[PDB]
Design an enzyme around this catalytic site. Structure first.
Site, short mmCIF file in Angstrom:
data_model
loop_
_atom_site.label_atom_id
_atom_site.label_comp_id
_atom_site.label_asym_id
_atom_site.label_seq_id
_atom_site.Cartn_x
_atom_site.Cartn_y
_atom_site.Cartn_z
N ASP H 43 -12.15 -2.29 -1.34
CA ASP H 43 -10.79 -1.84 -1.62
C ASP H 43 -10.37 -2.25 -3.03
OD1 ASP H 43 -9.83 -0.42 0.68
OD2 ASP H 43 -9.83 -2.32 1.78
O1 LIG Z 1 -7.03 0.99 -2.49
P1 LIG Z 1 -6.16 0.40 -3.57
O2 LIG Z 1 -6.25 1.26 -4.81
O3 LIG Z 1 -6.64 -0.99 -3.89
O4 LIG Z 1 -4.59 0.36 -3.06
C1 LIG Z 1 -4.05 -0.84 -2.59
C2 LIG Z 1 -2.80 -0.51 -1.79
C3 LIG Z 1 -3.10 0.71 -0.91
C4 LIG Z 1 -2.43 -1.70 -0.91
C5 LIG Z 1 -1.63 -0.23 -2.74
O5 LIG Z 1 -2.13 -0.02 -4.03
C6 LIG Z 1 -0.81 0.98 -2.29
O6 LIG Z 1 -0.92 2.01 -2.86
N1 LIG Z 1 0.10 0.85 -1.17
C7 LIG Z 1 0.91 1.97 -0.71
C8 LIG Z 1 2.19 1.40 -0.11
C9 LIG Z 1 2.68 0.08 -0.71
O7 LIG Z 1 1.92 -0.61 -1.29
N2 LIG Z 1 4.07 -0.32 -0.58
C10 LIG Z 1 4.51 -1.58 -1.17
C11 LIG Z 1 4.04 -2.77 -0.35
S1 LIG Z 1 4.71 -4.29 -1.09
C12 LIG Z 1 3.82 -5.71 -0.39
O8 LIG Z 1 2.64 -5.69 -0.35
C13 LIG Z 1 4.58 -6.93 0.13
C14 LIG Z 1 4.53 -8.09 -0.85
C15 LIG Z 1 4.55 -9.45 -0.16
C16 LIG Z 1 4.14 -10.58 -1.10
C17 LIG Z 1 5.30 -11.12 -1.93
C18 LIG Z 1 4.82 -12.01 -3.07
C19 LIG Z 1 5.64 -13.29 -3.20
C20 LIG Z 1 4.83 -14.43 -3.83
C21 LIG Z 1 5.71 -15.56 -4.36
C22 LIG Z 1 4.97 -16.47 -5.33
C23 LIG Z 1 3.92 -17.33 -4.64
#
Ligand SMILES: *OP(=O)(O)OCC(C)(C)[C@@H](O)C(=O)NCCC(=O)NCCSC(=O)CCCCCCCCCCC
Ligand SMILES: CCCCCCCCCCCCCCCCCC(=O)OC[C@H](COP(=O)([O-])OCC(O)COP(=O)([O-])OC[C@@H](COC(=O)CCCCCCCCCCCCCCCCC)OC(=O)CCCCCCCCCCCCCCCCC)OC(=O)CCCCCCCCCCCCCCCCC
Ligand SMILES: CCCCCCCCCCCCCCCCC[C@@H](O)O[C@H](CO[C@H](O)CCCCCCCCCCCCCCC)COP(=O)(O)OCC[N+](C)(C)C
Ligand SMILES: CCCCCCCC/C=C\CCCCCCCC(=O)OC[C@H](COP(=O)(O)OCCN)OC(=O)CCCCCCC/C=C\CCCCCCCC
Ligand SMILES: CCCCCCCC/C=C\CCCCCCCC(=O)O[C@H](COC(=O)CCCCCCC/C=C/CCCCCCCC)COP(=O)(O)OCCN
Lengths: 124, 128, 84, 459, 103, 178, 70, 88, 55
Positions: H43
């Site tokens: 991925d």
């Molecule tokens: O196949 P790839 O090209 O690698 O695609 C990866 C992926 C499919 C996951 C992504 O690029 C994508 O296109 N997703 C589609 C929907 C999407 O991603 N919507 C947003 C989701 S946001 C999320 O992941 C929640 C974040 C939680 C983490 C918060 C961070 C806080 C940390 C604080 C400091 C330590």
């Protein structure tokens, strides 16, 4: 610390003020009042040129210790008896200062007790 | 929910906290594309002038010339006497002078009066 | 004079998660249905001469045994020489 | 005094009868010889003066200025040799003639024993400088610059002439010795106030005083390198010398007439110094630093104490040498880059290390690092000002800090960091430029060994 | 994602050119062609030239020029204790007042 | 650095950049390797729970609350590699980098040392001189009208050709010259 | 001016016996010095002169009268 | 310093060493030219983690714009070599 | 050994009327105690830098 708590949290007039101490005549307690004796004269104490803060009642032991230090130069631990003697004399000076503090405190206690008894007799 | 970040003049807003980057519209994409296009044109011009073997001189930058000219020589012809400029000029150019005059004059009058009354103790004051 | 001696890498099959805190991490992760894919990349930090640790107090008392023995010898000699 | 004046005059026929390819060599050699001869004026007395004749006299205030004036000419010739390569022989000879005439006028002005004679030569110094600025200047602003440099000056000096003749109708003499020996107090009167202003403003405008300084950045950034050198090193000190000479007849009015100028200086030195913090031109920055130093000299002269006068003399000499060196360094960059913008040529320590060392020494001297004579003058002035009023230290202290900042700023922007990638025409430094910097900087560090030479007549 | 074919090809060409350029930066065995032309022991010479000569010059300067003027080298007065004797005069400083000694 | 930038970052690139930043700052918080491994696996699990979501609006609502949560807990002193733009040795060797053209100003007594180097340098100069005249025309005909749309450059397509604008990239000073 | 030690790549680095014995010797020296000084000069830490109790002094030596005389 | 002059073979060996310790990919299947998404079925998050492991292994950081388009071990090796000026 | 203290005013720089500025050195307890310590530390640091700044 306890004297700080006593003066600052309790009655301030009950305890001596270090800046204005002593407040009572030296003869108030007992009339003997023997004088303190100094051994080192002005001239030799000036010749040894100690310091204006080392020029105290223990200065003769300091002069003797300095003589030992100068005389036995390479053996810097040769003369430790006179260091002990000077330290003991300074200890006795500090104990005398503590006795002065205690005497002033007790005299203040007694004066306030006299004032309270006189006020009670006047109110009665 | 978490405590919010409040931007200031000297601590600006992070790009990841801009709502403007989450409000995507076709017009925004077109603006970004044409900004990249003009940047690319300028970069191509600079790199063509920079990699040329024949050239042996400092490359002239019109932007730098415009900056220096605007900072130095374009000031007065665009100056207009307005209440704001007049007031700021009067304050910033006159107030400090009279403030310092008052301070120094008061100090020297005090010293002169003390000298005349004789109570200053200038002993050993030989060099002036 | 520089270090051109053709250093050869150890065998990658050598690094195993067993007997390390990474094993406990893997167990805790499996308790939630997860796995650690990079576990064997860190195993060398707990494998060889790095496998044994020293406490803070043990670090402070690094040379206490030999110093204590020398002090005992010296004080015994001082006693046996003064008492003469 | 004619043993110096006559060879300086003989420089002109020697220049004009020289071969086409030997003008610079002969001019430099004979100017250096004249400087060596003028070195003998340094033998001064604790008594009155070296009164050679009825027309000329020398003092321990005039002697260092004369030595600096005679020493600056060979350096100016060396600095001008480069950018005048493609010029016809007649015009090169005219340039050298202008420099020689300026030196002659300055020499005579410093040693003149008569106030009117002093005024005439003090004004005669204008014509060569104006011709040099408006003829061999590079940009189109030079014409405007010249106009400013002229009219400001004249606007100050026409009243002085009036005052001067008025004085000679009242005292009967303008000879400085008689004027000093027959001095009388000035009563507080409106007529006396305007006489004071007439006697003071001409010298204030050429220091220059803050608020009357607008001509200086124009003139210094538009002049050729030799013009900048002579303007910063010698022509500024004419006002200081004149005020030192003329304040003997202005007492006790100066006790309260000095207040507006003192403030204008004490605040002014702050402003100009802060101006140096935000400047995009090297020459403009150096000119504004000159304004700040001369504001300190103005304060020293207005305080009117022995330490003030000693500090003012020392600071005048030190600033002359330092500002000339800084202008020469900036010009040596300009002749390679042709821009005169600070942030264009960067990281030059990597490409020119010895020139970077020269830059460091010049910046350190301008920063007044002890025991340089710059700091000697500054500290004497500061001590005298502290005696005048203890509050002054605040402003003085602030200036010190600010000065260091901008000095090091100029050193960091041009010498440190990464080199500019597209600038590929930075050639190794020539022996001429290195020798120019060495001949600027060695006299300063030599003078720190015998400061009494530059401490004036009140030492 | 990844490189476009044009980006890939330009990268390979550029890196081949860069590797050639870097290889051309090495020196041949004869490259620094140096032109020759002229016109306890080390510690001994160091101690002679860096310690003995400066100390000789400084001692001469202090002993015969600096002290030729008054107050140039001013010494702190040596301390005198009871029971000492003076070389210049020869008198004996009297002892102290025989203070009562105990502990 | 080497790759030309685009006009904008897509949603996927922004998500991946957040993932990298969050993992790096979590590593800065969790000093020990096993603790970091555990919490990084937890963060990976938290990150891909919305991996399969389809609509853009809420997927953008996520990655906004994620940025806010990151900025609240971002470890104000994160670990930086020493050569990275915030590291302790970022531009340490910048003062030892000298351009190649400076060698053209060497004295002949200096160029007398290293004759082989300067012969190779002359070869490089003549190669550059021919390739430039070819490259200018190649770039002229390969460019769309109205100017470039992206600051990406083409490779060489002929046999004896060189990539356009190659000299100042190939003749970089070095990473550690002295 | 040292000896050659090659890198190890994920293994404990090579150590000389000289540095080991030197480090152990200096640590032992520090501990012996501390023990020796504590054995010989213990008053530098625990003190030599007892601290008197101010409330334990009798009123006779403090010049205190039984609250009736003066 | 006293840093040995790493070579292309060393860079390739270390890259493959780090990749073989990634239990997501089979050590038999991967090669220098084996692609990440198509050849090994990984991925984008896996690619980010692989780049981070490379950065930790070699002690320097790869910028995201460059790191996002490194899809084979061979291009990782080439990027590291170009960054660190490796001759052979 | 003794307590030797010294002032060495060797070179006369200048004299502003009643103020004489000369090159003077105070060789007191502070100077003669701090100079050996500074020289010892500097010797150690220079030996260290011979290894640290080799490249
Ligand atoms: O196949 P790839 O090209 O690698 O695609 C990866 C992926 C499919 C996951 C992504 O690029 C994508 O296109 N997703 C589609 C929907 C999407 O991603 N919507 C947003 C989701 S946001 C999320 O992941 C929640 C974040 C939680 C983490 C918060 C961070 C806080 C940390 C604080 C400091 C330590
Ligand atoms: C300190 C004692 C020294 C004793 C030994 C003799 C010293 C001779 C000094 C001569 C005067 C200065 C000469 C300046 C021009 C240099 C020309 C040059 O290019 O040389 C290149 C030459 C060859 O190098 P290179 O390979 O070409 O260099 C390549 C790059 O350019 C790279 O070049 P670089 O990086 O090597 O740059 C040169 C280097 C050095 O270059 C300089 O900075 C020169 C200028 C330094 C001073 C700046 C002005 C400050 C005010 C000074 C006023 C006092 C003057 C005294 C009389 C001076 C008479 C000339 O830069 C620095 O190190 C910074 C210097 C900062 C000094 C700060 C302290 C100053 C005051 C010290 C106290 C002095 C009085 C003490 C009183 C109390 C005790 C008695 O190298 C040198 O010669 C360097 C000389 C070492 C520096 C001397 C500094 C101390 C001397 C100060 C003045 C004399 C003091 C005498 C009393 C001492 C007691
Ligand atoms: C622009 C950049 C700077 C240029 C240089 C500026 C420096 C020049 C400043 C001039 C110095 C001051 C001039 C006069 C000072 C005398 C003191 C007097 O003014 O103060 C009071 C005087 O009161 C009032 O000032 C009366 C005069 C008021 C009218 C004058 C105009 C005021 C502001 C004008 C400023 C314009 C300057 C620029 C001109 C183009 C004292 O009261 P009094 O005891 O009774 O008079 C004492 C004098 N006696 C003894 C001769 C009688
Ligand atoms: C070196 C190798 C050569 C060895 C032969 C010489 C051996 C010693 C013989 C020297 C003869 C004595 C001598 O030098 O002459 C005295 C002469 C002083 O002349 P005077 O007129 O007496 O006093 C000054 C006021 N006019 O002394 C000297 O010049 C040499 C000693 C000077 C001290 C060193 C100066 C170093 C510092 C440079 C100045 C720095 C700026 C000033 C800082 C001031 C600080 C407050
Ligand atoms: C950079 C631009 C500066 C411009 C010059 C500023 C200085 C102006 C100084 C005043 C100008 C005239 C000076 C007069 C010459 C001195 C002679 C003198 O003092 O005699 C006085 C005469 O004094 C005067 O008449 C002066 C009157 C002023 C007339 C001219 C006005 C010029 C402008 C005045 C205001 C500006 C002055 C300060 C300007 C600050 C800088 C901008 C006494 O005359 P008596 O009648 O013989 O004696 C009295 C007893 N019977």
């Amino acid at each position: 610390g306890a004297h700080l708590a006593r003066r600052y949290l309790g009655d301030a007039s009950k305890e001596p003020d270090p800046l204005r101490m002593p407040t009572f005549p030296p003869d108030y307690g007992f009339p003997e009042r023997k004088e303190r004796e100094m051994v080192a004269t002005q001239q030799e104490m000036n010749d040894a040129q100690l310091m204006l803060q080392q020029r105290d009642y223990c200065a003769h032991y300091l002069i003797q210790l300095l003589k030992c230090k100068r005389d036995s130069f390479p053996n810097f631990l040769a003369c430790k008896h006179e260091q002990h003697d000077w330290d003991y004399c300074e200890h006795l000076d500090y104990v005398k200062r503590m006795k002065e503090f205690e005497r002033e405190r007790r005299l203040l206690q007694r004066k306030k007790r006299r004032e309270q008894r006189e006020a009670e007799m006047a109110r009665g | 929910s978490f405590p919010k970040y409040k931007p200031s003049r000297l601590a600006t807003l992070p790009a990841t906290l801009d709502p403007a980057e989450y409000d995507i519209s076709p017009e925004t994409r077109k603006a970004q594309a044409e900004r990249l296009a003009i940047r690319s044109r300028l970069k191509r011009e600079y790199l063509l002038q920079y990699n040329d073997p024949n050239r042996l001189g400092v490359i002239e930058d019109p932007a730098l010339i415009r900056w220096t000219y605007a900072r130095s020589a374009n000031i007065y012809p665009n100056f207009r006497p307005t209440p704001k400029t007049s007031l700021l000029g009067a304050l910033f150019g006159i107030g400090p002078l009279f403030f310092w005059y008052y301070v120094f004059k008061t100090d020297r009058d005090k010293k002169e009066k003390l000298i005349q009354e004789g109570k200053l103790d200038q002993t050993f004051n030989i060099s002036y | 004079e520089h270090g051109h001696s053709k250093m050869e890498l150890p065998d990658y099959k050598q690094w195993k998660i067993e007997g390390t805190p990474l094993e406990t991490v893997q167990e805790k992760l499996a308790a939630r249905g997860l796995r650690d894919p990079w576990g064997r990349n860190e195993a060398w930090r707990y494998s060889g001469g790095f496998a044994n640790n020293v406490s803070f107090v043990g670090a402070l008392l690094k040379g206490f045994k030999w110093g204590f023995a020398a002090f005992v010898v010296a004080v015994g000699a001082e006693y046996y020489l003064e008492s003469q | 005094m004619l043993k110096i004046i006559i060879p300086t005059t003989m420089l002109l026929p020697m220049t004009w009868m020289s071969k086409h390819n030997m003008i610079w060599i002969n001019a430099t050699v004979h100017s250096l010889l004249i400087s060596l001869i003028s070195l003998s004026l340094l033998n001064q007395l604790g008594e009155n003066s070296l009164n050679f004749s009825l027309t000329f006299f020398s003092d321990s205030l005039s002697a260092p200025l004369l030595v600096l004036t005679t020493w600056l000419l060979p350096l100016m010739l060396m600095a001008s040799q480069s950018h005048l390569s493609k010029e016809t022989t007649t015009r090169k000879k005219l340039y050298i003639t202008m420099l020689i005439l300026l030196q002659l006028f300055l020499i005579m002005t410093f040693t003149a024993t008569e106030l009117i004679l002093f005024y005439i030569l003090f004004e005669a110094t204008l014509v060569p400088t104006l011709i040099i600025i408006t003829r061999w200047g590079n940009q189109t602003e030079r014409l405007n610059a010249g106009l400013y440099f002229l009219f400001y000056t004249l606007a100050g000096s026409l009243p002085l002439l009036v005052a001067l003749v008025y004085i000679q109708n009242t005292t009967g003499s303008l000879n400085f010795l008689i004027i000093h020996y027959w001095s009388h107090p000035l009563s507080n009167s409106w007529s006396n106030i305007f006489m004071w202003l007439a006697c003071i403003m001409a010298f204030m405008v050429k220091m220059p005083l803050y608020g009357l300084h607008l001509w200086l950045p124009k003139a210094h950034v538009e002049a050729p390198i030799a013009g900048s050198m002579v303007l910063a090193a010698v022509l500024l000190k004419l006002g200081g010398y004149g005020m030192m000479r003329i304040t003997t007849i202005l007492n006790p009015l100066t006790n309260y007439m000095a207040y507006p100028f003192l403030m204008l200086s004490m605040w002014g030195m702050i402003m100009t110094s802060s101006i140096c913090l935000r400047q995009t031109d090297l020459k403009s920055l150096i000119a504004y630093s000159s304004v700040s130093h001369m504001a300190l000299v103005i304060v020293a002269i207005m305080i009117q104490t022995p330490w003030s006068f000693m500090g003012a003399t020392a600071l005048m000499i030190a600033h002359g040498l330092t500002s000339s060196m800084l202008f020469c360094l900036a010009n040596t960059n300009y002749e390679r880059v042709h821009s005169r913008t600070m942030i264009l040529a960067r990281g030059l320590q990597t490409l020119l290390p010895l020139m970077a060392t020269w830059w460091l020494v010049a910046s350190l001297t301008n920063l007044a690092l002890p025991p340089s004579i710059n700091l000697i003058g500054e500290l004497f002035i500061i001590t005298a000002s502290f005696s005048w009023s203890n509050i002054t230290i605040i402003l003085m202290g602030m200036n010190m800090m600010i000065t260091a900042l901008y000095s090091l700023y100029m050193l960091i922007t041009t010498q440190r960091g990464k080199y500019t990638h597209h600038i590929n025409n930075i050639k190794p430094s020539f022996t001429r430029e290195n020798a120019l910097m060495a001949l600027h900087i060695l006299p300063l560090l030599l003078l720190t060994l015998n400061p009494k030479m530059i401490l004036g007549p009140l030492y | 994602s990844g490189y476009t074919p044009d980006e890939k090809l330009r990268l390979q060409q550029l890196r081949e050119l860069r590797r050639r350029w870097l290889k051309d930066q090495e020196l041949s065995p004869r490259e620094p062609v140096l032109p020759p032309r002229r016109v306890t022991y080390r510690h001994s010479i160091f101690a002679v030239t860096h310690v003995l000569i400066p100390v000789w010059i400084i001692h001469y300067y202090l002993k015969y020029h600096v002290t030729a003027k008054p107050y140039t080298v001013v010494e702190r007065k040596p301390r005198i204790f009871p029971g000492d004797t003076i070389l210049e005069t020869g008198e004996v400083i009297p002892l102290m007042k025989e203070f009562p000694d105990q502990h | 650095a080497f790759s030309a930038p685009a006009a904008y970052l897509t949603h996927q690139q922004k998500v991946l950049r957040l993932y990298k930043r969050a993992l790096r700052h979590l590593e800065s918080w969790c000093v020990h390797r096993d603790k970091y491994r555990y919490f990084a696996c937890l963060m990976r699990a938290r990150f891909d729970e919305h991996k399969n979501e389809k609509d853009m609006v809420k997927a953008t609502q996520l990655l906004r609350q994620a940025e806010e949560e990151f900025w609240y807990g971002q470890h104000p002193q994160p670990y930086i590699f020493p050569e990275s733009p915030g590291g302790t040795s970022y531009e340490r060797y910048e003062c030892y980098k000298v351009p190649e053209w400076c060698l053209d100003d060497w004295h002949p007594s200096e160029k007398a040392m290293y004759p082989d180097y300067f012969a190779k340098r002359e070869q490089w100069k003549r190669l550059r001189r021919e390739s430039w005249e070819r490259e200018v025309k190649q770039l002229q005909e390969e460019t769309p009208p109205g100017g470039p749309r992206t600051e990406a450059l083409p490779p060489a397509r002929k046999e004896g050709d060189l990539p356009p604008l190659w000299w100042h990239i190939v003749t970089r000073p070095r990473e550690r010259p002295m | 001016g040292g000896v050659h030690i090659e890198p190890r790549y994920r293994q404990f680095p090579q150590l000389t016996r000289s540095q080991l014995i030197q480090a152990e010797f200096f640590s032992a020296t520090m501990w012996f010095w501390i023990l020796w000084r504590f054995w010989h000069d213990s008053d530098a830490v625990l003190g030599h002169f007892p601290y008197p109790d101010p409330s334990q002094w009798t009123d006779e030596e403090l010049g205190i009268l039984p609250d009736d005389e003066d | 310093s006293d840093a040995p002059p790493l070579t292309l073979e060393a860079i390739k060996d270390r890259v493959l060493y780090v990749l073989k310790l990634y239990d997501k990919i089979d050590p038999e299947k991967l090669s220098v030219n084996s692609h990440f998404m198509k050849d090994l079925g990984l991925d984008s998050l896996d690619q980010v983690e692989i780049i981070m492991a490379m950065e930790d292994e070699f002690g320097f950081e790869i910028p995201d714009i460059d790191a996002e388009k490194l899809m084979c071990p061979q291009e990782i090796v080439d990027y590291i070599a170009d960054k660190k000026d490796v001759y052979e | 050994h003794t307590g030797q203290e010294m002032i060495i005013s060797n070179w006369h720089w200048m004299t502003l009327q009643t103020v004489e500025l000369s090159l003077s050195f105070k060789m007191d307890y502070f100077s003669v105690m701090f100079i050996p310590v500074a020289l010892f530390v500097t010797w150690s640091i220079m030996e260290f830098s011979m290894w640290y700044m080799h490249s």
